[PDB]
């Protein structure tokens, strides 16, 4: 993307959250613990009505917008902390998150059927019930492994498209020609079956993560606003490769 576009999106987000989201930020700041997790709920229709350029920049790459909004929220947190009058019952948190809700009623964004293969990288909204439920488990994210034959440390990350496996690097990004677990998250696995009232239906393997864990009850109606992505499998010689379609959740609702 262009250099100015991300910046402009940042100012739009920070202005909106500063003008109409002071109360939730104030309550989040006035809380115990330092690094657990803290989300912020932001509506959509008002934001897209305020400016006609955020929607175009958003609904083709649902990847950078969330990170930019997170950065804007962090900058707002720094600003409100700096301009504070009662610095006694307050605490600073470095773990904030975004949560979009309130999409339009366009026929292509309120799909009641699972997309087959033509919706990858899009922002959708599916509805259904719950069948199965896995157990709470903890992943490892980033290693910062020991520096070999050079000096500057590395910050390589994991990959979601390869079942969270780590690839061994060999080409160091060092300027010269030289080239050679206190981190945790949360996890879960839920399966959603389409309702028969509005129709045999098939099912999706929705993947939850972070604060959304432990928020579903077996046998309840859900409405998830998540991105659709693909999960590969390690390749074997002269066989048929296997793929699957999952839905990384970005919000949730308990509407019934």
């Amino acid at each position: 993307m262009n250099s100015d576009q991300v910046t402009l999106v940042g100012q739009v987000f920070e202005s909106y959250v500063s003008e109409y989201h002071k109360n939730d930020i104030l309550l989040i700041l006035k809380e115990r613990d330092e690094d657990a997790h803290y989300p912020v709920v932001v509506n959509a229709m008002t934001l897209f009505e305020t400016n006609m350029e955020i929607g175009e920049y958003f609904n083709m790459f649902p990847s950078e917008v969330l990170t930019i909004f997170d950065s804007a929220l962090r900058r707002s947190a720094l600003t409100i902390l700096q301009s504070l009058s009662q610095p006694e019952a307050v605490s600073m948190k470095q773990n904030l998150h975004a949560r979009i809700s309130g999409l339009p009623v366009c026929p292509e964004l309120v799909r009641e059927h699972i997309p087959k293969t033509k919706d990858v990288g899009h922002f959708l909204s599916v509805t259904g019930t719950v069948i199965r439920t896995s157990l709470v488990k903890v992943l490892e994210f980033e290693r910062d492994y020991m520096c070999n034959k050079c000096k500057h440390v590395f910050v390589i990350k994991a990959d979601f498209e390869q079942y969270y496996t780590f690839c061994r690097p060999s080409s160091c990004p060092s300027l010269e020609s030289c080239d050679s677990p206190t981190r945790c998250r949360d996890y879960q696995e839920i399966k959603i079956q389409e309702q028969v009232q509005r129709l045999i239906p098939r099912s999706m393997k929705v993947i939850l993560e972070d604060d959304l864990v432990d928020s579903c009850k077996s046998g309840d109606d859900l409405t998830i606003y998540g991105i659709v992505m693909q999960r590969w499998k390690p390749f074997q010689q002269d066989v048929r490769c296997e793929v699957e379609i999952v839905l990384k959740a970005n919000y949730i609702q308990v509407n019934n």
Binding site: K116, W232, F235, V239, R240, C241, V243, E244
Partner: protein, 274 residues
């Protein structure tokens, strides 16, 4: 300089004006050009499907006037005859869109061919060895509709040294390696996967089991009728429910790894209903 812009998507060969397929190309393109003003442009534009009726080809038009070997060529050659019709459709649609735009660019996607209404009904209990890679027709019911799972056919690979990544046409979902890279020059190898670039393309899939009808030969022996599988590829799927009366026409190929022990299944090319 090639009049057919979609050459890369279609037949994968260096363009040379020596193949005998060219004459069939003009024959098909002329036949489609004369009979062009009866198709809804939007339907073909979205979902590639030209429901060509074989009776019209049999009616003795220019298709047989220019070349008389149509039935034999279709039966013996599964792909060379079949994809030429798609090439002609793509070319004529591109030309029509270009003319319309010029009067008042164009990136029309892949369009499949659909040849149905095939007369000689080669029913089951007679497809054992000879009918391998020959266009045939069947008739039966459906009992074992399965679930949908995608697959990839043109996933890309990484490049060595300089750039110029490629989208090697991997065949029928079997992983291979591009031991040669044409590129401009120099060595190949470059054996690495890049399964994130938009070069990779995927499509749907399914599997259907057919039990052939009672027909005739009311033998007293309680041998259940033979069953043969089917494989729907793209723009199909959810077109059948358990228990129908459908007619399926498609190529007969040989599976693997049910070790030279294989079975027979049919890759569908057109479906009907009743």
């Amino acid at each position: 300089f090639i009049p057919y812009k979609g050459w890369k998507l279609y037949f994968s060969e260096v363009y040379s004006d020596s193949s005998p397929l060219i004459e069939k190309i003009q024959a098909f393109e002329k036949f489609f050009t004369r009979h062009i003003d009866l198709y809804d442009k939007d339907e073909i534009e979205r979902k590639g499907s030209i429901l060509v009726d074989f009776k019209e080809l049999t009616e003795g038009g220019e298709v047989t006037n220019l070349i008389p070997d149509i039935a034999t060529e279709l039966r013996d050659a599964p792909e060379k005859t079949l994809a030429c019709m798609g090439l002609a459709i793509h070319q004529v649609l591109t030309k029509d869109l270009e003319r319309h735009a010029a009067e008042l660019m164009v990136n029309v996607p892949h369009i499949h061919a659909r040849v149905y209404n095939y007369e000689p009904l080669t029913q089951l209990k007679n497809v054992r060895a000879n009918y391998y890679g020959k266009y045939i027709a069947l008739r039966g019911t459906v009992v074992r509709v399965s679930n949908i799972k995608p697959l990839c056919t043109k996933m890309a690979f990484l490049c060595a040294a300089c750039g110029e990544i490629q989208s090697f046409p991997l065949p029928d979902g079997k992983y291979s390696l591009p031991t040669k890279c044409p590129v401009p020059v120099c060595r190949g190898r470059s054996f690495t996967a890049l399964r994130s670039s938009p070069l990779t393309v995927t499509m749907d899939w399914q599997s259907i089991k057919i039990q052939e009808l009672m027909s005739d030969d009311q033998r007293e022996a309680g041998r259940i009728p033979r069953t043969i599988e089917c494989e729907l590829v793209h723009d199909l799927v959810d077109s059948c429910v358990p228990g129908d009366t459908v007619t399926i026409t498609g190529i007969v190929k040989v599976s693997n790894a049910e070790k030279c022990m294989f079975l027979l299944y049919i890759e569908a090319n057109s479906i009907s209903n009743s």
